[PDB]
């Protein structure tokens, strides 16, 4: 593959998510730009159905690892770009400790020059008064590592990592992520050695936006293989 050449400049991003958590339906739309040369995404997300029924932080990892910066010495390990433009399916189960889980499925692919991430999400078994449905999480940035491994049986990758969400009472809500990605096309892909993606995030609000929303500035770098 030569998917990597699709990412050498600034790429427009479109994100769509339809969710259902304990029967509470909602939609999110996002836009921005990616500049994988610097690992950068600049994004704004809006809840298009009114108020979001779960906290924005719990949806961040669901709402494009193809924009990571792979150092030159690790370019052979970039599955995500190698699958483009036809794209990949990204599926996760996220288990929130002592609460419910999200199951997500997304297709990430080019539609012309725009990188589009379409997502459904279903959440079940949430506590109606817990830290999620009760909106008890701090609106703060999520940074950290996603561990990537090859999944040769599926001609893709798996990933795993735990997000530590800050709760307003000073505790932490652990979100244990299990991820599987598979190419949509039948062209060749890169199957990587073990490595991780490190994400540095800045999260904010747009003072002129009246809709329920989240603004993000993300930098994502591949690491874990020296040189």
How would you describe what is shown here?
The PDB classes it as fluorescent protein. The protein has 2 helices and 11 strands. The chain has 227 residues and is mainly β. It has one domain (1-227): Green fluorescent protein (Green Fluorescent Protein), CATH 2.40.155. An 11-stranded mixed beta barrel has the order 1-2-3-11-10-7-8-9-4-5-6. The radius of gyration is 17 Å and the shape is globular.
- How many domains in all? 1
Distance between the termini: 24 Å
Quickly name the level 1 CATH class.
Mainly Beta
Number of helices: 2
Counting DSSP E segments of at least 2 residues, the number of strands comes to: 11
Alpha carbon gyration radius: 17 Å
The helix/strand order is: EEEHHEEEEEEEE
Condensed summary:
It is classed as fluorescent protein. The protein is mainly beta and 227 residues long.
What keyword list fits this structure?
mainly beta, Green Fluorescent Protein, eleven-stranded mixed β-barrel, 11 strands, 4% helix, fluorescent protein
Q: Mind sketching the topology for me?
A:
Blueprint: E1 11-21, E2 24-35, E3 40-47, H1 56-59, H2 79-82, E4 88-96, E5 101-111, E6 114-124, E7 144-151, E8 156-166, E9 172-183, E10 195-204, E11 213-223
Parallel strand pairs: 1-6
Antiparallel strand pairs: 1-2, 2-3, 3-11, 4-5, 4-9, 5-6, 7-8, 7-10, 8-9, 10-11
């Amino acid at each position: 593959s030569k998917g990597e050449k699709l990412f050498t400049g600034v790429v427009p991003i479109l994100v769509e998510l339809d969710g259902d958590v304990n029967g509470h339906k909602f939609s999110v739309s996002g836009e921005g730009e990616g500049d994988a040369t610097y690992g950068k995404m600049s994004l704004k997300f809006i809840c298009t159905t009114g108020k979001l029924p779960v906290p924005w932080p719990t949806l961040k990892t669901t709402l494009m690892q193809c924009f990571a910066r792979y150092p030159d010495h690790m370019k052979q390990h970039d599955f995500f770009k190698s699958a483009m433009p036809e794209g990949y399916v990204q599926e996760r189960t996220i288990f929130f400790k002592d609460d419910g889980n999200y199951k997500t499925r997304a297709e990430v692919k080019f539609e012309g020059d725009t990188l589009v991430n379409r997502i459904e999400l279903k959440g079940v078994d949430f506590k109606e008064d817990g830290n999620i449905l009760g909106h008890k999480l701090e609106y703060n940035a999520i940074s950290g590592n996603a561990n990537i491994t090859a999944d040769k049986q599926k001609n893709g990758i798996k990933a795993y990592f735990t997000i530590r969400h800050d709760v307003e009472d000073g505790s932490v809500l652990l979100a244990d992520h299990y991820q599987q990605n598979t190419p949509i096309g039948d062209g060749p892909v890169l199957l990587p050695d073990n490595h991780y993606l490190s994400t540095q995030s800045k999260q904010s609000k747009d003072p002129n936006e009246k809709r329920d929303h989240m603004v993000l500035l993300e930098f994502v770098t591949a690491a874990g293989i020296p040189l």
